[PDB]
Paper text:
[name] is a [name]-glucose (UDPG)-dependent glycosyltransferase, where UDPG is the sugar donor and [name] is released after sugar transfer. [name] alone performs β (1–3) glycosylation of Reb D and Reb M in [name]. Our data establish that [name] can transfer glucose in a β (1–3) manner to an existing glucose A at both the R1 and R2 positions (“ends”) of the steviol aglycone. The enzyme [name] shows an unusual degree of plasticity in substrate recognition; it is able to transfer a glucose to two different ends of some steviol glycosides despite having a single active site.
We have determined the structures of complexes of both the wild type and H25A mutant of [name] with [name], the wild type with [name] and Reb A, and the wild type with [name] and Rubu. There is one molecule of [name] in the asymmetric unit and no stable symmetry-related multimer is identified by the PISA web server. The protein structures are all essentially identical within an r.m.s.d. of 0.4–0.9 Å over the Cα atoms. The electron density difference maps show clear density for [name] in all structures. [name] sits across the two helices Cα3 and Cα4, contacting three β-strands (Cβ3, Cβ4, and Cβ5), and is perpendicular to the central six-stranded β-sheet of the C-terminal domain. The uridine ring of [name] π-stacks against Trp 338 and forms two hydrogen bonds to the backbone (amide and carbonyl) of Val 339. The O2 and O3 hydroxyl groups of the ribose ring form a bidentate hydrogen bond with Glu 364, and a hydrogen bond forms between O3 hydroxyl and the side group amide of Asn 27. Two of the α-phosphate oxygens are bound by the main chain amides and side chains of Asn 360 and Ser 361. The pyrophosphate oxygen and two oxygen atoms of β-phosphate are linked to the NE2 of the imidazole ring of His 356 and to the amide and hydroxyl group of Ser 283, which is in the flexible loop between the Cβ1-strand and Cα1-helix. Upon Reb A or Rubu binding, the β-phosphate shows a slight shift, but the rest of [name] remains unchanged in our structures. The interactions with [name] observed here are conserved in other GT-B fold glycosyltransferases.
Author numbering: 11 to 169, 172 to 459
């Protein structure tokens, strides 16, 4: 192959997934693929015989800052600022030796990194290597981020109570959404600033989205980011099953085959989300009160003070519920049994659900999640946002609204229609197809 692309993921599930979907889409367009990855949280390389992996940054000589960090929880993510602050020299050496050791008929066209690797911009620049960025969060989230200076001056960033009102200058959000999203503003201000700055300075931004999903946000991206933006809905191309870091339960499909069509609520609150025991029990009570069948992925550590789901009484989630640890999520969402998805509103999950035409119930645990929940619930109207905590009646009502009630037909139909828009976008002539054609041509032009 004439042209090689190097991709550099953030080594967590929500970041490795999109970047290896992208790598596949690019391989299909005729690029060879090298993945630069930490040893930490590496995917299964035997799932990718067509890719070359090069492991970097935490190899066994290994700096003292990255040694001793836990492999899971919230502290595992301290690898990100550490690598941003200390990885530049090594990333440069690794890139250069690959650029030099390439064939006569082969060239390295570009580096694609996660947006959180803001340090890679200065490194790629120093090699005259073009860096493109993969955003793993939505265009709307970005639009909210660049509106922070106006939120600050309106005094929405102070923990003042105008919580239920539309935000002035940003009518799609309520003040509470902004409060929730930017609950650690003063803390994360500097690092978020760096990610934005270096994304703006990149050679192109690939968004895991499609035009017809976030059409209100496209002008912001054209205005605020001088580099070209490309929108590709990765889950429409292929699922992320090959980049799973955990063993799929898979016995779920036998259970799903015993369920009537559209009768199952899929429930998953996210990789690092945490609840008090009180709220965990309130969620379970909500699920039982809904009377719907459910498949609930609970990650160990979801319930504060418990290893897994110990506070649940025996048989409390009777015949119609199943709790598992891990599934091939998009494949589950594609299964005919699934009627809805109660999500924490992480962007991959949200987008997978959209691409599978599954309507949603939204909870959030901050960051971009309340913004995704607000946009999907109030703008697209493909789900119901439980935006006032956890209360069994409200939960049960939301589940039933989406899965059963005639009054929620609009939500179900909107989800079907939005899937169709995603499918159309991929076909020759569609917005994503053309965005991908432009990306391929753009990358091929960079030399
Ligand atoms: O049981 C599971 C739960 C999650 N996922 C995948 O893990 C990723 C989670 O990303 P997301 O952005 O939704 O949120 P995070 O969990 O990173 O907060 C998605 O691609 C899901 O499809 C999965 O394959 N199986």
């Amino acid at each position: 192959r004439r042209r090689r692309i190097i991709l550099f993921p953030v080594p967590f599930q929500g970041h490795i997934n999109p970047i290896l979907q992208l790598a596949n889409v690019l391989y299909s367009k005729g690029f060879s693929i090298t993945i630069f990855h930490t040893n930490f949280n590496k995917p299964k390389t035997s799932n990718y015989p067509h890719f070359t992996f090069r492991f970097i940054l935490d190899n066994d000589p290994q700096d003292e800052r990255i040694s001793n960090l836990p492999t899971h929880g919230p502290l595992a993510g301290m690898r990100i600022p550490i690598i941003n602050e200390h990885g530049a020299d090594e990333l440069r050496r690794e890139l250069e030796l690959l650029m030099l050791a390439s064939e006569e008929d082969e060239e390295v066209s570009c580096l694609i990194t996660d947006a959180l690797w803001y340090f890679a911009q200065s490194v790629a620049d120093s090699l005259n290597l073009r860096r493109l960025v993969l955003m793993t969060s939505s265009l709307f989230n970005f639009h909210a981020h660049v509106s922070l200076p106006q939120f600050d001056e309106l005094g929405y960033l102070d923990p003042k109570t105008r919580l239920e009102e539309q935000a002035s200058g940003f009518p799609m959000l309520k003040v509470k959404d902004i409060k929730s999203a930017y609950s650690n503003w003063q803390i994360l201000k500097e690092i978020l600033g760096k990610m934005i700055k270096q994304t703006k300075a990149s050679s192109g931004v690939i968004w895991n989205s499609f035009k017809e999903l976030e059409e209100s946000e496209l002008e912001t991206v054209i205005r605020e980011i001088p580099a070209p933006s490309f929108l590709i809905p990765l889950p429409k191309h292929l699922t992320a099953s090959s980049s799973s870091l955990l063993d799929h339960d898979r016995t779920v499909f036998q259970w799903l085959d015993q369920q009537p069509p559209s009768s199952v609520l899929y429930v998953s609150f996210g990789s690092t989300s945490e609840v008090d025991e009180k709220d965990f029990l309130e969620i379970a009570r909500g699920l039982v009160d809904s009377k719907q069948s459910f498949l609930w992925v609970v990650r160990p550590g979801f319930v504060k003070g418990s290893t897994w789901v110990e506070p649940l009484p025996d048989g409390f989630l009777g015949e119609r519920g199943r709790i598992v640890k891990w599934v091939p999520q998009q494949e589950v969402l594609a299964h005919g049994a699934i009627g809805a998805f109660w999500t924490h509103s992480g962007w991959n999950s949200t987008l997978e659900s959209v691409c599978e035409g599954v309507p949603m119930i939204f909870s959030d645990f901050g960051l971009d999640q309340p913004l995704n929940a607000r946009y999907m619930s109030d703008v697209l109207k493909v789900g119901v946002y439980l935006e006032n905590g956890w209360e069994r009646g409200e939960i049960a009502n939301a589940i039933r609204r989406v899965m059963v009630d005639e009054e929620g037909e609009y939500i179900r139909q909107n989800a079907r229609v939005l899937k169709q828009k995603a499918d159309v976008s991929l076909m020759k002539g569609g917005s994503s197809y053309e965005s991908l054609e432009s990306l391929v041509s753009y990358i091929s032009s960079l030399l």
